[model samples]
Target: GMAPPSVFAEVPQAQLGVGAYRTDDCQPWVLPVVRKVEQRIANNSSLNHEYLPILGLAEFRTCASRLALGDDSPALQEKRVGGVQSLGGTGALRIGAEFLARWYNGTNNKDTPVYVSSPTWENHNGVFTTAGFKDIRSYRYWDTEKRGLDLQGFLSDLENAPEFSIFVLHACAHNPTGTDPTPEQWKQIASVMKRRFLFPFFDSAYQGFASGNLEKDAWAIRYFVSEGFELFCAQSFSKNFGLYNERVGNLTVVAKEPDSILRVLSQMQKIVRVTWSNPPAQGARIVARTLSDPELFHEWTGNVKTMADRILSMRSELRARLEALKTPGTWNHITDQIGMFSFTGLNPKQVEYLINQKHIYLLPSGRINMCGLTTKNLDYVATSIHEAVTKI
Candidate 1:
């Protein structure tokens, strides 16, 4: 999640070394809109610090459902989508993992393992394993040669996984590698999942932040739903809404019947009750306000698009300079990859070489944050990267 400089600057001096896996901080939200939200909170009389319901703010849930499932989705229309406000994407995933462990995985069902991509967010394995899932595995996702999705290998692995297995997928703007499947690839993957009956769980951390258009970013999730697969989607307001500390997220289960949805959701509430009792109100309220009001919604959406456009521009500038310098290997992937990250295709050796030989810093995994690039630093970073790749 993008945090503002305030958070990064707050880090202790002692902790800044090697890969600052945790930055001092990041872009919280669009500064202006967050300030407006703060002003609204100060002026509101109804806003209180009381504990929210286990399911979270009634208004918030209603708005969140509409935002994720689309305004007129069949699931929303039939009241078949079940959702619970969570601590963030992590919390949402934890809740879903628990629900699946209880109903789907069994002692004798170890053969039907839960699968994630080869290099997924490190926290995913921990979350599901902690949720009582015993068998966990990885399917192919990234291809270093092309620096893009290995769709064929990915589908092959998914097909080999036991029927009824759960597969955690990045809904959009895949982190780490930042590579996502094409629309045609998504349909093909969906077809394979349908044929195999593999369960799909989406970790949707970046909705509007990926493409600047909320609906466009959500095409993968919507396509899966349209395929009639009862799936789980975890929503995070952390990045786009800049509510990271607020821990705002939701886990929605799209089911067939209202009763079935209720039964499933009731169990999820127990998980929430034991874990955190209730979600915080301030962030959810602010988010609900932004989501439900058409005027505010439009403004907030624009703010996200603005941030996204900045990242996209940085991608172009960085790649162009790399090309101009004729730094070894093709660097077009930097511009081709969307969202906050672009797999620079540099190995750990090269990454360390850059940090040691130059002051430029990124992850050991060669994942650079495009958000960190600005007009001031883009050229400098590009030159540093060029030198590191060419010399090392």
Candidate 2:
């Protein structure tokens, strides 16, 4: 059984909102570019409903790996990088987990330990746990006292973890908390990981969405690859491409050598055979076409920027509103954090009050989706949040 994000029964729609909650709107958002490309896909006679290969559509995998690793990534140029299309970030991670649990340590070693962030995505724990990992552990990530990254604590934990243990990193726009290590800090993390011979498993669900710039958001993953670390990444296109239900994802692996990468892909394909056999073709086809065509790619990037810019705008609006009201505690973190979510530092009691009294919806941990705040509701949310923290 999986542990889902904590939720209370739905409140009346008019009473409250699920601020940003991942979707920019309470309604499903269909990216205009996606619609255009999907139409092109439908009209093109060459495209068929045929099942894709177990390894997935080659075009999609190549484009996706290139998207995450960058065009000039040495691993890509050296033929040491390989990937497989997945159901989504979740499926990609599961594939990676199973692959590592079964073959990472080879025949002699059975113990496969993995370290995840303390406040990681709720599903991360279950994915690895169900994969039968014996030593799934957590490393300090969020420093509640400072309301920011605990870099030293994170690095220290990695430095002392077992050699060859897998460390799962949120490549960008860390979920739940929206806090990411600075570039210099990421370099320090890489340095320790290299020293300890630890493996890096990056969960890259937000590539272009974090900073509204794909390359900027991918800085950590690309940096790790450039430093020549053998790593695996789970990439999801659901958010950026606005294809949530399409389930577009890929698992990109960077190996030390081409031969090793090929061997790894061969093994991963075996796992794919049993898991889903082959991923759906529609979403992958849309992504491949979008990534390959210059015109379409530019359009898609603009759409990504549109979504990202909106989220950033909401962050500014919320922070400004809180400041105007002079909310009880420092509201700087609201703007300091990146991506879709924000950790408001509101305690469970305040969160409960907001839900029960105000009808606004957010995780009990005080994590709010920036997109959930709109021009119409922004003031109400800011006011409600202010009241929640100050009133009682």
Error of 1 at 105 (Å): 4.4
Which residue pairs collide in model 1, if any? Answer: 3-26, 3-27, 4-26, 4-27, 7-24, 7-25, 8-24, 8-25
TM-score result, candidate 1: 0.91
Worst 10 residues of 1 by lDDT: 15-24
Minimal lDDT window, size 10, model 2: 15-24
Instruction: Give one digit per residue, the lDDT tens place, for model 2 in 1-392.
Output: 76885576455577222422244455656877889998998899987788899989999999999999998888899999999999988999999998888888665244767899989898998898887887889999998888999988998899889899999999999988999999999999999999888999999999998889999999999999888899999999988887878999999999999999888889898999998988999999999999999999999989889888888999888888888989877878887898888888888778877888987888878888777778878868778988988886
Q: Give the per-residue lDDT of model 1 (tens digit) for 1-392.
A: 76555757767787202211111133334445666876888898886677778989988877876778799788888888977999888999998888787776553343458899878888999998888777899999999888889999999997788888899999888887879998999998898899998899999998988878898888898888888989999998888887778888988888868898988888888888999999888778888888877888988888888878877887888888888888989877887787787788998888877788776787787888787776777657778878787787
Q: For every candidate structure, what is the RMSD over all alpha carbons to the true structure, in angstroms?
A: 7.4, 6.1
